[PDB]
């Protein structure tokens, strides 16, 4: 049958969702000190 590995490498659930929710407050950053 079709053999595939459900375990990935980079496709992991990160907890860095902050950067996605801050877009509702700030759009374009004035500086890139990150």
């Amino acid at each position: 049958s079709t053999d595939s590995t459900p375990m990935f490498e980079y496709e992991n659930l990160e907890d860095n969702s902050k950067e996605w929710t801050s877009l509702f407050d700030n759009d374009i950053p004035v500086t890139t000190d990150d």
Binding site: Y10, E19, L23, F24, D25, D34
Partner: protein, 81 residues
């Protein structure tokens, strides 16, 4: 200075700047004043304070689902070529 950029993450987050919300996702957030699908122009909804707390909880799903769809759209399970 400091500058972190992973090739795998950069490609996903940097591309989310110019990404229009598909019709499949538009159904989750109906009656949109801008009527624009590009996120750069859609974010204005929250900036103009038009987005209410009740809309906020809905936008969260849209952005998340969009990020997931973008990954599959890049791979493509169906190749006509």
């Amino acid at each position: 200075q400091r500058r972190q950029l992973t090739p795998q993450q950069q490609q996903l987050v940097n591309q989310m700047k110019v990404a229009p919300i598909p019709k499949q996702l538009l159904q989750r957030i109906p009656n949109i004043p801008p009527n624009i699908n590009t996120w750069q122009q859609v974010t204005a909804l929250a900036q103009q304070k038009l987005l209410t707390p009740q809309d906020m909880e809905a936008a969260k799903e849209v952005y998340k689902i969009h990020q997931q769809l973008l990954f599959k759209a890049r791979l493509q399970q169906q190749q006509a070529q």
